[PDB]
């Protein structure tokens, strides 16, 4: 009724290997998903993959693998993949499911109803052995980029989709809505895009060319375009018609992608929205590259590759999604490299926080009786609680890098403030004194704590359990001073973030 927060990251072609790329992207969606549930919105967060096409059938004919068995086994990829990285989403939506062929159908009901769907011939280069066409652009030296063989001029009755009927409306919607396109770079590159005809595009297939995937409701002698099946997910996972998840989250839509795949979510489906009566979505936060360590796009043939699993290996979930999160200014080509991990994580976590928590435990259990001692205002300190409402908006305009420096300068204003005072010192001729200063350490990590829980879920709770705090949280919490208790602390806590 008041808050609610839906987030969406692109479904994956399901046959493809996870890479940095998607890991990134879904991250960050994580991130904005757990962020909002923190601070008390109704959260959806879906994500899914892509399994339709003749790409994929043939896949699965190659292994020799009927084709709802081989997508069913590679989507599974995608899903640990997400475990692996701690990804807390609310779907997985897959394009077999019977729920999206019934939205699909419907939809392609409405459009054609509209009249916006016409019979017609596609004709142009096409490659035989691939059984599709290729446009010149992406043709290799003219010739397939798969069989690297050339290719002949064919044509193919297909239904097409009139997309240009709409563009002036999509155009004059994103001129009165600055905000839409969310990164401004890519606003400008949209409306760039909507200056020049965008024609009608093919929206079906014969079955005889392509038979996995779904019917048009109106001829079940074609099957509907990857292209317009795959977009409709993010209706399809709601239930769209009559599903109460649809009438709750779509009217906060908020879709991440990586620029590669900005024309299809920025032009294909606000056209495809209109077209059949949906409400556009409210954000579309387009993400750059994440470049390999010499500046270059990442690719095999560089042998700058990047893998994340590797370093989530070798570092940790928590440490690479921090990274990602604080290195990459969300929508700017940025480049990654196991060595940035490795600074990042020696010095912000090894280091700023981790070493923070060991000395403040030692000392509790110096200079407090191993507890935290009573509560006591917070004076230097008390700024803390003023960081939440700081960073609501910088998360909300996806600067999630500037969030996180933020919390972490905190951080280091509270090693700043014990080096400053010296409770060891403090002790000596005043022990009251140094309890007082303890507590505000301790109450200034819950703080922090809870302010970085969306970026390293695990690690912000084992740090709570290290001091004995309440573990789980709400970012209100965060707001008020005074809340950790005097109660005592584990007798032992492993090191937080262990040296690599
Ligand atoms: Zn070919």
Redesign the pocket.
Known sequence: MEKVFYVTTPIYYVNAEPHLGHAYTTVVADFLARWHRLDGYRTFFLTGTDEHGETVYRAAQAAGEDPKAFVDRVSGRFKRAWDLLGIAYDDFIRTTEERHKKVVQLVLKKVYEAGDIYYGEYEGLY??????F?TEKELVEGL??????P?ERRKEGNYFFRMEKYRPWLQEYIQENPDLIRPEGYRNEVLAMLAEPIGDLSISRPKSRVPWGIPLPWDENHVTAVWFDALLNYVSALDYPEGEAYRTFWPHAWHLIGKDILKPHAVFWPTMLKAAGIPMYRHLNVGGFLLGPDGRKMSKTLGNVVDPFALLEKYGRDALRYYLLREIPYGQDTPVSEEALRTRYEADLADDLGNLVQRTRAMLFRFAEGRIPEPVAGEELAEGTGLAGRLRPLVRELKFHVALEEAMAYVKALNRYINEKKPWELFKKEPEEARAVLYRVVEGLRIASILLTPAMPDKMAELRRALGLKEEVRLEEAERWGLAEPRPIPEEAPVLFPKK
């Open positions: 490659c035989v052995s691939c059984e599709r290729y397939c980029p798969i069989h690297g063989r290719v």
